[PDB]
Amino acid sequence: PTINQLVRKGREKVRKKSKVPALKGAPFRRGVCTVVRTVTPKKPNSALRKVAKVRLTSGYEVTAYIPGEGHNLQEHSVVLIRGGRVKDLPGVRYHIVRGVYDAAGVKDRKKSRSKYGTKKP
Amino acid sequence: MVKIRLARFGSKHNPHYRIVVTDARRKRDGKYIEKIGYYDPRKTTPDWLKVDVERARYWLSVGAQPTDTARRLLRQAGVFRQ
């Protein structure tokens, strides 16, 4: 565009979109589990991925992934959720934090224990 | 009224005062009208006390009231000397 056109109209800035709107600007959110189940991933992966339906303190109700091998979550469990989507699961945008509230740490975990919330043996 | 007093600067257990002219209602570490001297009570330096004598004389002439410590420091620097 010409200089006069830039003076008349300018350049439009770029507005970013939040990928974790249910967090409402917080790093983490507490919630209560309503449904715990397994879901199947999209092509090409094949598995039974453990997820929870979580009703949060911020008013939203979302789906969160449960990482690690084995878990103790069930209906009415209190959990903490953090950002981060699971690529191969449709509509899953959040991760349950292991080792907080009613979500126990991963048993017999020996590597990368700060994730999965396992104490030093 | 306008006063000549000491504003605290420096850090914890390390006080360094500025001899400043300011309105009495201002908080002690707030904005002042002008700055005329400085003081180091611990005397860690060869020159731990400086006073602008002519400016202090001017401000005294127009009704500024010094504080006890400020008056003592001005007397040490020789403002009231005749």
Binding site: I3, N4, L6, V7 | -
Partner: protein
Amino acid sequence: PKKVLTGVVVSDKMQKTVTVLVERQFPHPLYGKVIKRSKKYLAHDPEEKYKLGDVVEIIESRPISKRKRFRVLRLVESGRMDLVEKYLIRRQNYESLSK
């Protein structure tokens, strides 16, 4: 010092008051090109000497009323109906901008 502006009388429908159109130029802060802007001032004209088309100087003054904080200082030139015509045509064009 009191600010003095120069402009052209574009309205004299009020008593003892003239509308003065003042123009200023400035470079664009980011794009650098010199651009023109205009602003209208209501100015006190107690003797009603100045009429449409007059180019006059006004000076910042004690408030004469709301919206009236300038006084006509002196006349600069007369017979400038073309500037008034530009302003009136620009104002008239707004009627076709509605929806």
